[PDB]
Design a protein around this ligand. Structure first.
Ligand SMILES: CCCCCCCCCCCCCCCCCC(=O)OC[C@H](COP(=O)([O-])OCC(O)COP(=O)([O-])OC[C@@H](COC(=O)CCCCCCCCCCCCCCCCC)OC(=O)CCCCCCCCCCCCCCCCC)OC(=O)CCCCCCCCCCCCCCCCC
Ligand SMILES: CCCCCCCCCCCCCCCCCC(=O)OC[C@H](COP(=O)([O-])OCC(O)COP(=O)([O-])OC[C@@H](COC(=O)CCCCCCCCCCCCCCCCC)OC(=O)CCCCCCCCCCCCCCCCC)OC(=O)CCCCCCCCCCCCCCCCC
Ligand SMILES: CCCCCCCCCCCCCCCCCC(=O)OC[C@H](COP(=O)([O-])OCC[N+](C)(C)C)OC(=O)CCCCCCCCCCCCCCCCC
Ligand SMILES: CCCCCCCCCCCCCCCCCC(=O)OC[C@H](COP(=O)([O-])OCC[N+](C)(C)C)OC(=O)CCCCCCCCCCCCCCCCC
Ligand code: HEM
Ligand code: HEM
Ligand code: HEM
Ligand SMILES: CCCCCC[C@H]1C(=O)O[C@H](C)[C@H](NC(=O)c2cccc(NC=O)c2O)C(=O)O[C@@H](C)[C@@H]1OC(=O)CC(C)C
Ligand SMILES: CCCCCC[C@H]1C(=O)O[C@H](C)[C@H](NC(=O)c2cccc(NC=O)c2O)C(=O)O[C@@H](C)[C@@H]1OC(=O)CC(C)C
Ligand SMILES: CCCCCCCCCCCCO[C@@H]1O[C@H](CO)[C@@H](O[C@H]2O[C@H](CO)[C@@H](O)[C@H](O)[C@H]2O)[C@H](O)[C@H]1O
Ligand SMILES: CCCCCCCCCCCCO[C@@H]1O[C@H](CO)[C@@H](O[C@H]2O[C@H](CO)[C@@H](O)[C@H](O)[C@H]2O)[C@H](O)[C@H]1O
Ligand SMILES: O=C1C(O)=C([C@H]2CC[C@@H](c3ccc(Cl)cc3)CC2)C(=O)c2ccccc21
Ligand code: FES
Lengths: 186, 54, 85, 75, 124, 383, 55, 124
């Protein structure tokens, strides 16, 4: 009404324990719970929502591609589509296999011998996508006369091992089985 | 209680770390708890409940 | 750091009288012939070395590299190409 | 009698000095934990994160070892 | 970089007889080719001024020097937009290329760097 | 008080396009900013128009672009205008960044518009690329593969991110439809950032070719620079017309008129002329992660110019040594461009590496050193 | 002076979402403005996402 | 609408015996139900002030009246946000509901309307 030093009555609102740590802590428990549910909610929202961009159910459909081998002459490479990625199938000659078995495994970005790669020396089966950034190497070209990725100039071997250029790994080998000796499934 | 404030709440770094770790725990336990609850209220209805026949 | 009209933030100016004439009163192309020939020659001459030096050097470098590359993929360049790979 | 005040200038850079920064080292620690916890929480859904991180945790790790029965899996 | 840095380094060079013998002629040629004198600038007109420190140094200039600086910048701006160079009395002669600003900025920065140093003092 | 000043909305327009006080001596290199604005407007107009005719589905995308060329009235114009303006956008943006580097526009007090600008430059690259992919020709599909595999560089999570960005195991329909969505979106984000870097610049105002303050002598943006910007608008449209109407395919790769075949990549892989410099950088480095880092770093390293330029003087008008260094840097960036489109063969492999080292050494070594020495030469030389 | 006030970009954000002086007695009907902002954000997020899938 | 309009029209009504007999009682109940007095406002506190004319009128208020107006608006804003009504002395009693502002705005507008009229005078 008049004196400004008589603070208005605040007793209906004032907490007696206002200066305790228990008092602050309770309010922060509320703010923290709200932060915790916001964080759980955010994570759930972002996770579920962004998953729309992951491969849809219709895309996730597996191939099991079967290919003949009678067709394929010596000294040739085929390209079989499998899961949209190309599969290089080369019918390697005896002297090609020999050439592959030569390179000391020691000096190979990705050290592997042909024996590890093929399950049958006459059937180099690889996922024909370059391990650098993902082009498909042009076969028979190169400098190690296997495959050469034209995109950034990485050279693969007759084992499809990387020899020169940015590609870090050797051309991946799919899971393939010879059901017959004349047909493989991938 | 002062101690609890001092450890987990006083530093904002600590408080945010606590909230995110709590969100982790909550997220994992809530998922599991609702899964069990959802299976109990829809008991015998869901594929997992009739799957055994096949 | 820059203000606006009226308080642009110039240190106080005093003693500069600026005069100009109306665009309608001036010939916009007065002395254009003189400028186009003599002024542009002046400005070009003064900047010429800053363009000529790097262009000529990188054109030389490109020329040498493209000539070597061409030569490596001839029959004569077989051996030098085999060494390069 | 004292002839001159006795002090050194501590090395400093962009107005940070080692005394001050050393007091904040713990706090970066906690914020790094918060970033670690938070980042790992964000990618808890990523299958690789479960496979390689979360399923390896003792006791708790069984939360992320879930196999879909091959009877209910079209893929 | 700070003007202090530039000035101290320049003084190190001018001290060393060998260094000055080889650097002073280089720097004089550099300045001739720089060609700021052909727009009637003094070297110091070209120092970046959009900085707390420099704004403070420029406020410390005597009114005379300050007014003349404004004029040289206006005049140079006019040469620039016309694509002309200074002629006659507008060309800065080597004797007129005085470091009018360097003393002011060195004082500004001296204090600013002392302030930074003393903010980091440790009682022993 | 004038309505243009009174009304809050008009006052914002006024402050940008009419009363904005500009230095009186900006030269023609200050015109790229408005050309990039014009490119951005052309791209939005032609782009939204192509979006009315283009089908994002992979089975139809390439054919919808042929339908645009062949059946839509003026479709040829709209398509070539969109494609060619994307090239002009990059000429103008390299010109604009060139101008900024030469005249020290990146120095205080303009580090913020510069740094926002560096992000606009990255967004333009991603926009233009995402737009390249939508044709779904041979280069389009392969470009998609490579860009979406740059995240494979990122260890562990990398491979999974790749699959997530493709929405598949390979670039296919999913990828093409999400590139369409984002290519439509990205330009509006880019226009936001373009606006933001102007708002950041509005605190300091434009730099000028002398690098001195212009606070002493300002000119209203209109009529002076409005009419000055028309000259380049018409000069730009002359160059635009020569490409769009007379040689619409000069700036294009033939291979993009082959529909995407995921089984072959063309033996002659050469990206857009404007990505060539960074592509040569990527080829130079023989490591996966290395190559990617270097390529991104070639853009991100522009962010450090504010630090590594130690000059007390803004820009290169008055620095003969810096101008020469800048000339060699620019020519090296053009050499990288050239090396981006030769075959990966001797001797250009080593040359490309040397040019890559020179590119980075400009920011890390030469600029800091030259700028230090010229500081000293100005001081000693004028005593 | 506070960064949020000094920096031109932050200052625009500040003027809208932080320091913006509002009347102290706005009731719940003043909340629709921000809900419309939230709807607009949801629509952009879900919309752009549907555009990634829609033909 | 202008306050002048409202005031002149009100005066036409109060003049006419019939009109006042039927309108004054209506207007008094309208004001009771309006309920601005329950937030401690005088009628005049509710007049829109974001116009040139009203700003001028408010600047013309005597300091006392002006300070009291600020207080009533602050207090009413506080009632509003608390969703409380005035009680006791805060409720505006009919005798306190004085048209403190009407004389000032009528003078402002009188001049503004004379100005408009005289801007359109024709020498005969
Ligand atoms: C793309 C879309 C099309 C739109 C066109 C926009 C291009 C316009 C532009 O920015 O450049 C024109 C531009 C004219 O601009 P200006 O405003 O008169 O002067 C700008 C220079 O700072 C002024 O430089 P200066 O005064 O030192 O004059 C230098 C110029 C002489 O300038 C001329 O005008 C010619 O000469 C040269 O540097 C040529 C080198 C010698 C070749 C042998 O031409 C150049 O000066 C180009 C020099 C680049 C090297
Ligand atoms: C859509 C998305 C969902 C998000 C929710 C947003 C809705 C919130 C909102 O604006 O309305 C709540 C809103 C609460 O707002 P408030 O800030 O408490 O008071 C605003 C009015 O001044 C409240 O007027 P008042 O102080 O005169 O209180 C009036 C209200 C009582 O207000 C309440 O507190 C309820 O009671 C009624 O008028 C109900 C009509 C009686 C029929 C029986 O409720 C109403 O005002 C409902 C009456 C509408 C007719
Ligand atoms: C939507 C995203 C949700 C993320 C929030 C998750 C964790 C942050 C949080 O809860 O904020 C609490 C924290 C702390 O809230 P506070 O700032 O009230 O607490 C500070 C006082 N101490 C530290 C003593 C308790 O807020 C922030 O740090 C702001 C980030 C929120 C966004
Ligand atoms: C190609 C080689 C470039 C060398 C340029 C050297 C300066 C020169 O002579 O240019 C003329 C002019 C010289 O102008 P100036 O303003 O220095 O000098 C005007 C005259 N004086 C000195 C008297 C005030 O420079 C420019 O206008 C340069 C603009 C640079 C644009 C670069 C684009 C390249 C894109 C790469 C992006 C990464
Ligand atoms: C969409 C692309 C862009 C547009 C439309 C744009 C537009 C503009 C405009 C209109 C200006 C002011 C006038 C001018 O100086 O030309 C300007 C200035 C500037 N821009 Fe850009 N810009 C764009 C991209 C960039 C990029 C990529 C950068 C930096 C990497 C950049 C950095 C700057 C800087 C630093 C300035 C201040 C330069 C100065 O006036 O001294 N901009 N821009
Ligand atoms: C910076 C703005 C833009 C740039 C740099 C850009 C760049 C490109 C490029 C390079 C292409 C490949 C063109 C070709 O070779 O055919 C393209 C295609 C396309 N752009 Fe854009 N674009 C931009 C804005 C937009 C916008 C706003 C839309 C709105 C949808 C759009 C829609 C398209 C469409 C539909 C295509 C594919 C049809 C075609 O190839 O012509 N673009 N864009
Ligand atoms: C104000 C913002 C928006 C409003 C009010 C709005 C409204 C709607 C509505 C009513 C539909 C019909 C939905 C249905 O019944 O299925 C729809 C569909 C669609 N909207 Fe939006 N939308 C908005 C923003 C956007 C934006 C930014 C995009 C970006 C592309 C978008 C993309 C779509 C797409 C692709 C569909 C068709 C797919 C569908 O029906 O779900 N929308 N929108
Ligand atoms: C209509 C009001 C909306 C405000 C934004 C619109 C545009 C705007 O501000 O235009 C101005 C004309 C501006 N030029 C300059 O600053 C300028 C300054 C100095 C010299 C010259 N030239 C020299 O000789 C200039 O050209 C320009 O071209 O910048 C665009 C990019 C802006 O677009 C945007 O940021 C929004 C979006 C369309 C990118
Ligand atoms: C981030 C920088 C850009 C600035 C714009 C961002 C948004 C912005 O200004 O936020 C504010 C929070 C604003 N609300 C208010 O003014 C506000 C004022 C009084 C009371 C309440 N509520 C009462 O209880 C309010 O909520 C709001 O919701 O407006 C959005 C629409 C704005 O978005 C845009 O316009 C851009 C686009 C997303 C629509
Ligand atoms: C910056 C953010 C960090 C990156 C964000 C990560 C985006 C993608 C991460 C996870 C998305 C896919 O990850 C996957 O999410 C879906 C939900 O969406 C979960 O799926 C689980 O929950 C959903 C409902 O919630 C059920 O339909 C499903 O049968 C069940 O397995 C998977 O258990 C998880 O493995
Ligand atoms: C979501 C995309 C939107 C991006 C645009 C981002 C910002 C949103 C609007 C900015 C455009 C107008 O914002 C502009 O900023 C200035 C400076 O802060 C504001 O100015 C406001 O705050 C300043 C200081 O805080 C006061 O002196 C002034 O009285 C007040 O009007 C104005 O509100 C407006 O003229
Ligand atoms: O191999 C490549 C390749 O490397 C790029 C490159 C070049 C520019 C790169 C880039 C430059 C700068 C930034 Cl900030 C980001 C990416 C993007 C990838 C392509 O655009 C390309 C297009 C078509 C087929 C193959 C390719
Ligand atoms: S893409 Fe195979 S070499 Fe880089």
């Amino acid at each position: 009404g008049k004196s400004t030093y008589k603070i208005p009555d605040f007793t209906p609102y004032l907490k007696k324990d206002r200066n305790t740590d228990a008092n602050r802590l309770f309010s922060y428990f509320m703010i923290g719970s709200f932060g915790m549910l916001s964080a759980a909610g955010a994570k759930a929202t972002v996770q579920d929502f962004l998953s729309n961009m992951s491969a849809s159910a219709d895309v996730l459909a597996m191939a099991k591609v079967e290919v003949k081998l009678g067709a394929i002459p010596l000294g040739k490479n085929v390209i079989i589509k499998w899961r949209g990625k190309p599969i290089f199938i080369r019918h390697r000659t005896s002297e090609e296999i020999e050439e592959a078995n030569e390179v000391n495994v020691a000096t190979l970005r990705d050290p592997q011998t042909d024996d590890e790669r093929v399950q049958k020396p006459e059937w180099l089966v690889m996922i024909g996508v370059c391990t650098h950034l993902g082009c498909v190497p042009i076969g028979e070209a190169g400098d190690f006369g296997g495959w050469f990725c034209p995109c950034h100039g990485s050279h693969y071997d007759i084992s499809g091992r990387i020899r020169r250029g940015p590609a870090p790994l050797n051309l991946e080998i799919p899971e393939y089985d010879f059901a017959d000796a004349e047909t493989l499934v991938i | 209680a002062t101690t609890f404030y001092n450890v987990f709440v006083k530093r904002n770094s600590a408080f945010v770390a606590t909230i995110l770790a709590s969100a982790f725990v909550f997220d994992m336990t809530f998922e599991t708890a609702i899964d069990n609850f959802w299976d109990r209220i829809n008991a015998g209805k869901q594929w997992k409940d009739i799957r055994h026949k096949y | 750091y820059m203000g606006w009209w009226g308080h642009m933030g110039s240190p106080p100016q005093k003693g500069i009288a600026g005069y100009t004439i109306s665009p309608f009163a001036a010939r916009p192309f007065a002395g254009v012939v003189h400028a186009a020939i003599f002024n542009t020659f002046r400005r070009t001459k003064n900047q010429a070395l800053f363009v000529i030096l790097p262009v000529s050097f990188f054109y030389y470098v490109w020329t040498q590299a493209s000539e070597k590359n061409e030569w490596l993929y001839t029959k004569a360049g077989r051996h030098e190409l085999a060494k390069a790979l | 009698y004292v002839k001159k005040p006795s002090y050194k200038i501590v090395p400093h850079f962009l107005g940070f000095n080692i005394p001050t920064v050393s007091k904040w080292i713990p706090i970066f620690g906690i914020w790094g934990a918060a970033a670690g916890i938070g980042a790992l929480f964000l990618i808890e859904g990523v299958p690789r994160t479960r496979q390689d991180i979360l399923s390896k945790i003792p006791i708790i790790g069984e939360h992320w070892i879930r196999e879909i029965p091959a009877s209910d899996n079209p893929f | 970089a700070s003007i202090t840095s530039v000035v101290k380094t320049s003084e190190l060079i001018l001290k060393s007889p060998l260094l000055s013998k080889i650097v002073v002629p280089l720097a004089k040629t550099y300045v001739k080719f720089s060609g700021y004198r052909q727009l009637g600038f003094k070297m110091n007109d070209l120092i970046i001024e959009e900085t707390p420190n420099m704004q403070l140094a420029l406020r410390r200039l005597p009114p005379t020097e300050s007014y003349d600086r404004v004029y040289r910048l206006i005049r140079a701006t006019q040469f620039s937009l016309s694509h002309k160079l200074a002629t006659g009395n507008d060309i800065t002669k080597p004797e007129e290329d005085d470091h009018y600003l360097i003393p002011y900025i060195l004082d500004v920065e001296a204090e600013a760097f002392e302030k930074d140093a003393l903010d980091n003092l440790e009682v022993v | 008080m004038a309505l243009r000043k009174k009304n809050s909305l008009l006052n914002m327009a006024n402050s940008y396009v009419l009363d904005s006080p500009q230095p009186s001596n900006l030269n023609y290199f200050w015109n790229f900013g408005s050309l990039l604005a014009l490119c951005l407007v052309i791209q939005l107009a032609t782009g939204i128009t192509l979006a009315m005719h283009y089908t994002s589905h992979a089975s139809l995308a390439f054919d919808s672009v042929e339908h645009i060329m062949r059946d839509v009235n003026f479709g040829w114009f709209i398509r070539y205008a969109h494609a060619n303006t994307a090239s002009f956008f990059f000429i103008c943006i390299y010109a604009h960044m060139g101008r900024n580097i030469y005249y020290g526009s990146y120095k205080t007090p303009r580090v913020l518009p510069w740094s926002i600008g560096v992000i606009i430059f990255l967004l333009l690259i991603i926009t233009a690329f995402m737009g390249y992919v939508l044709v779904f020709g041979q280069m389009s599909l392969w470009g998609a593969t490579v860009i979406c595999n740059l995240v494979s560089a990122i260890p562990w999570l990398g491979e999974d991110i790749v699959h997530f960005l493709w929405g598949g195991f390979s670039v296919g329909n999913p990828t093409l439809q999400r590139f369409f969505a984002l290519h439509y979106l990205m330009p509006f984000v880019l226009a936001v950032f373009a606006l933001l870097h102007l708002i950041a610049l509005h605190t300091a105002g434009s730099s000028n070719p002398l690098g001195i303050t212009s606070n002493v002598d300002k000119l209203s943006m209109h009529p002076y620079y409005s009419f000055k910007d028309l000259i380049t608008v018409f000069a730009f449209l002359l160059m635009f017309t020569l490409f769009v109407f007379f040689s619409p395919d000069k700036l294009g790769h033939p291979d993009n008129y082959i529909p995407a075949n995921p089984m072959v990549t063309p033996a002659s892989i050469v990206p857009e002329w404007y990505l060539l410099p960074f592509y040569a950088i990527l080829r130079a480095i023989p490591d996966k992660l290395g190559g990617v880092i270097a390529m991104v770093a070639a853009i991100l390293i522009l962010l450090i110019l504010p630090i590594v330029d130690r000059s007390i003087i803004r820009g290169n008008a008055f620095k003969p040594i810096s101008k020469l260094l800048f000339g060699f840097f620019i020519c090296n960036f053009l050499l990288l461009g050239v090396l981006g489109q030769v075959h990966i063969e001797p001797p250009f492999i080593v040359l490309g590496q040397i040019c890559t080292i020179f590119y980075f050494s400009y920011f890390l070594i030469l600029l800091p050193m030259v700028s230090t020495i010229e500081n000293i030469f100005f001081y000693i030389g004028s005593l």
